[PDB]
Structures are given as C-alpha cells and as structure tokens.
Structure 1
Amino acid sequence: AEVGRLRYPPEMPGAEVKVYKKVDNVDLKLYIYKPADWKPADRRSAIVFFFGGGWQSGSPAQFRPQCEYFAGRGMVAMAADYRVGSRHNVKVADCVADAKSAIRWVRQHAAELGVDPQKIVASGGSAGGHLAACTVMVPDLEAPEEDHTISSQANAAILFNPVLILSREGLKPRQDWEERLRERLGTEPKAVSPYHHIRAGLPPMIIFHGTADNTVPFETIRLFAEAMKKAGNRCELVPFEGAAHGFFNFGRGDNLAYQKTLELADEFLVEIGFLAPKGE
C-alpha cells in the first residue's frame, strides 16, 4: 500500500538524471546516485533497480533508499524507469526490452559513469525482480535502436520477491492458459519465464522471498533455486518466514526486513567480489 502511494515521476533528490532510451515518444530515465568520492576514471560496481507493480504501475522511488545505501558503500546505484501498462499500454515483453536497454546503456556508458562494465548488478522487486532476472538469463527478444555489439546481460542479480515462472510447461502445458499468457505477455510465455532458461554458466544471484507470499508462491522460487543449484549456479535463496509479498520495502515492518535484506545483499556482493569488505 505504501509503495502504491509513491510518486510518478519521482523527485529522486540528489540523483543525476540520464535518459537511457527514447521509445514510443517517452524518455525513459535512470536516476543515478554516486558515492561522495566518485571521480571520472573510477571502475566501480553498479546496481540498477527495477520497481515493482505488476508491469502495470510503480515508481523508481521504491528503490531510492536502497540506491542511497549502495552509493554509500561505493557503488554507482541507480533506479530505472521502464514502460508499464497503465501509462504506456505495453505488455511484459516491452518491459523486458526496456530493462535490457538499461543494462546495455550502463555498459555502453560505463567509462563516463566510473563503472566497471563487468560488475553491473540487476535488481528489483516483484515484476521488477522478474525484469532483473530476465536481464541475467533470458535471451534478448528484440534489437531496439541501440548498440547490439554491447551485451545487455547483467553480471549478477539481487531479487526481491521476483516472479520467476511465467509458463506452466514442464510443471505438474495446458493450451488455453498458455495462449492467454501469450496475449498478456506479448510473446511466447516461456520466452519471458526465467525458470525456463535455467542452464549452467549463469551469473550469480541472491533472492529474498517470504514464505507466506500469496502473490508469488514461495514454492515457485524454491523450485527455481533448486534447479539453478543443480545446474552449478550460485543462487542463494533467503526465506523470510511468515512474510508476504512486498515485505522487504523501506517503511514497513519497522524496517527490519529492509535492513536485513540490505545486510545480506551487501555480503553477497562482497562474496562475489563486487564490493570491498566493510573492514576498509
């Protein structure tokens, strides 16, 4: 509900604004937070957050607090806008293209951003967590007007109650439901279903999910994580006992889950060599 009251477009005080994509006569922006000691020539890790809201609504403001945290730790942290149903009459596949365009843009512009182009983390909540996962493991579905010699693939992901299974193929593949998914998603459902793209050799990830989630059942995420681990990938699943969809957000449950998810995300980033340990 609180997340639902966020402003669009957001103020994002202290952020630098860059347009990463011009599409359908809208300028899609990144809201960029740099560390206090940032200099051109830096080669910092970066994180790009994609807001939640069912691919229908939401605001980059959702992840402003996390951006401020990670910029405090020395990352170039940013929150991306992307097209949504209520504002732009797009479908899920369009959202995925925008998320991929954002990672591509950060990589293309890594030098001027003071960023290491092989340390770009994709992150998000719910629908935005789906997008982040798509940037790590789903093939590009379109080639927009952008540098396709530059990869859209993120180097790691941090997912907050993501949607990871968008097709029922290979679960316990009924036709009419997959056809309804096709019309909603703008493509074959498997083409935007991270679970259907599990293979060896993928970037590392951490996932935070409530065990009492009625929106995205925890069991879908357990299945995902088990299969990823079977494929040899680093896929850390942190259950939040009794928590529901949206539990991790700044401003709810006394900020306890907010703080805990940041702590664990920080250690994950140290583990994979994207952040220096807090001990310096």
Structure 2
Amino acid sequence: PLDPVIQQVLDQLNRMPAPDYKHLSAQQFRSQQSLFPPVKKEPVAEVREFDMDLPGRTLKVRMYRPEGVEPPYPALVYYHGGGWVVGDLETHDPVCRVLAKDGRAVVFSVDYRLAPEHKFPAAVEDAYDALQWIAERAADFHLDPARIAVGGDSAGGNLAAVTSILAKERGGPALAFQLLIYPSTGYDPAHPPASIEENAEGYLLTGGMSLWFLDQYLNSLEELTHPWFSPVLYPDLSGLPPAYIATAQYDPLRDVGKLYAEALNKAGVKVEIENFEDLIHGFAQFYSLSPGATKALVRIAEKLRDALA
C-alpha cells in the first residue's frame, strides 16, 4: 500500500485546486514550496556556508560536518531536487543533515542556478564546476580525495549522474560513489518506462508537473535526448562511479531509476538499487514526519556510509 503519513500528505495536496501549468510561473511555484511541513533538523558538529566564485557566477555552498568523524573526511557533494526550478539550500537542509549524520560524511550542499533564469545546461555546469572547486580544495576541507561522492534527489540525482559522466570525460575529479535518490536519469521519450504512465497522477510529482519543469529548464525538443539531460542515453557508461539508486513505488520516475541501474550494470559499473514500496517521489522531504520516509532516508544515508567506509 501507501505510507500513512504520505497518504495524508496527498490528501491535503489534492484538496487544493488542480495546478494550472499553462500559467504557473517559476516565482509562483517557488512560493508553493513553503507548503512543505516543518521537519526535524538532525544535529551535526558544524554547519558552514561559503561562496564559490566561478566564472560567470558565485554559487553558495552549505557544508555539514557530522559529529564524531575524524579527518581526512569522506565527503558528499549534494545537489538538491526541485525540477531544476525550485528548491535551495534551505529546502533540503534537513535532508543534508541526515546524510551527513548517518552517512558519516561531510556534505556540501550546492546552491546551483535555477531555470528559467538559467536554462539548461547551467545547472549541469554548476554541478560539475562545484565538484571541481570542492575537490580542488580537498586539503582546505580536510577531505580524503579518494572518498568524495556526488549525490542528489530527483533533478539533483540527475545532476549527480551527469556530473559523474563529465568528470569521466574531463579526467576528474575522482568520484568514489554516486548517491542517486529517485533520480531523473532520463530515457528515450519515444519509449518511456512503464512507471511514467502508471504514476502520472496523484503522487505529488506528476506528469504535468514534470512537463512544466521541462518547459522551464530545456530550450528545445531535441534536448530531451541530450546526454546532459538524459544521462542514460550517454553512449558509454562504463568506468562511472559505483552507485546506489533509491526509487519510490509511486514515483513516475520509478522505472527511470531502474533503467539507469540496468544501464550502469550493463556497462560493468557496480550498482545497487532499492525500491521503497510504500513511498512517493520526494519522500526524503518528509523525514521525521512519515515513518516510511524516515527509515528510507536513514537507510540511504547508511548506504552512503558503507560506500565511503
């Protein structure tokens, strides 16, 4: 079935007017993000924010150092979700804390630029350049160069997967692991995985909502098959960092996640994929509220922990 609290979330959500994507704007939708209930912020030894001055832009970064972990620390460069349009350092702050605290790794939450103000592939360039910037400063952050992972949820998982591919092409930096939480890893639009139609409606992330995101992020039809947008279409996935993929049973992106796992495995990359049976897309954001989401996110963090051990 469906997690009890998730069920109550959808009930409260379906009480609202049917979204009007034809007229919804990025600003309007960013406001709707305040609808997410307050969540518990797990404690960490330290939270620090700093600027990364990159060509053309300064990206904010929130670093979370967990308690009781000795340097050189393993790290996770994290990219928040939100369809490449919404979200920020605050929306996924609770998520990053859990990953740091139970993942036993220093998490760097990257405030990448959002569309439509910055269309594709700005976010992608930000994800990569941010990882480069942080790895370059491994020493300054007391990080173990060999234990730096990339990860993210939804659009964030997409950015992590694409960043991995770009690091491979550019000879670095070294990525030890890929944490992809119900990621949007792409697929050939002409041949969608079964979950796209199956969970198209009523489970928070909907077909219409994804369409709306795509219209804000992408510039043209042709980019739907662009590898930087659909990493699963990249011609050669071998040599990519080993990965852990979490999918949700009621997520339209469920089989998309499975598609990437399958693709990575076929390319000889070690990959573990787990489907959470009673959850929906975005369940991490209900950490400490939903019992299913809480155990799932903690589990995901422990998967990360074992990965960087």
TM-score class normalised by the smaller sequence: 0.7 to 0.9
CA distance in 1, matches of 2:66, 2:227: 37
| TM-superposition CA deviations, 1:57-97 (whole Å, max 9, x none) | 211223322333344354211211000015xx112311000
Q: Is the 8 A contact 2:74 2:143 kept in 1?
A: yes
Q: Partner of 1:54 in structure 2?
A: 83
Within the candidate set 122, 125, 134, 2:162 is matched to: 134
CA distance in 2, matches of 1:71, 1:171: 34
Q: Partner of 1:213 in structure 2?
A: 251
Q: Is the 8 A contact 1:100 1:152 kept in 2?
A: no
Within the candidate set 16, 20, 27, 2:48 is matched to: 16
TM-score by length of 2: 0.69
User: Is 1:238 paired with 2:274?
Assistant: yes
CA distance in 1, matches of 2:288, 2:67: 28
What percent identity do the matched residue pairs reach?
27
Q: Which amino acid aligns with 2:96?
A: C
CA distance in 2, matches of 1:185, 1:4: 27
Within the candidate set 75, 95, 101, 1:66 is matched to: 95
CA distance in 2, matches of 1:245, 1:37: 31
Within the candidate set 117, 126, 131, 1:103 is matched to: 131
Q: Partner of 1:259 in structure 2?
A: 295
Q: Is the 8 A contact 1:211 1:240 kept in 2?
A: yes
CA distance in 2, matches of 1:36, 1:160: 24
| TM-superposition CA deviations, 1:150-169 (whole Å, max 9, x none) | 82453211111111115447
Q: Partner of 2:258 in structure 1?
A: 222
Within the candidate set 205, 211, 233, 1:196 is matched to: 233
Report the alpha carbon displacement of residue 23 of structure 1 after superposing the two structures with TM.
4.8
CA distance in 2, matches of 1:53, 1:248: 12
Report the alpha carbon displacement of residue 191 of structure 1 after superposing the two structures with TM.
2.8
Q: Is the 8 A contact 1:6 1:62 kept in 2?
A: no
CA distance in 1, matches of 2:99, 2:280: 25
Report the alpha carbon displacement of residue 221 of structure 1 after superposing the two structures with TM.
1.9
CA distance in 1, matches of 2:75, 2:288: 26
CA distance in 2, matches of 1:257, 1:228: 26
TM-score by length of 1: 0.75
| TM-superposition CA deviations, 1:149-191 (whole Å, max 9, x none) | x82453211111111115447879xxxxxxx996248968423
Report the alpha carbon displacement of residue 234 of structure 1 after superposing the two structures with TM.
1.5
CA distance in 2, matches of 1:267, 1:245: 19
* Higher mean C-alpha deviation, range 196-205 or range 97-106: 196-205
Count of residue correspondences: 248
Q: Alpha carbons of 1:206 and 1:257: their partners in 2 closer, same or farther (altered >3 Å)?
A: same
CA distance in 1, matches of 2:175, 2:295: 24
Q: Partner of 1:84 in structure 2?
A: 114
Q: Is the 8 A contact 1:66 1:262 kept in 2?
A: no
Secondary structure of 1:238's match? Answer: strand
Q: Is the 8 A contact 1:167 1:190 kept in 2?
A: no
| Unaligned segments of structure 1, at least 5 residues | 142-147, 173-179, 276-280
Within the candidate set 146, 149, 157, 1:118 is matched to: 146
Q: Partner of 2:7 in structure 1?
A: none
Q: Is the 8 A contact 2:66 2:105 kept in 1?
A: yes
Q: Alpha carbons of 1:171 and 1:38: their partners in 2 closer, same or farther (altered >3 Å)?
A: closer
| Unaligned segments of structure 2, at least 5 residues | 1-12, 14-30, 194-214
Q: Is the 8 A contact 2:287 2:293 kept in 1?
A: no
| TM-superposition CA deviations, 1:234-276 (whole Å, max 9, x none) | 2111112242221222447524323323224313531x3x13x
Within the candidate set 144, 161, 181, 2:182 is matched to: 161
Q: Select the structure with the greater relative contact order (CA < 8 A; seq sep ≥ 6).
A: 2
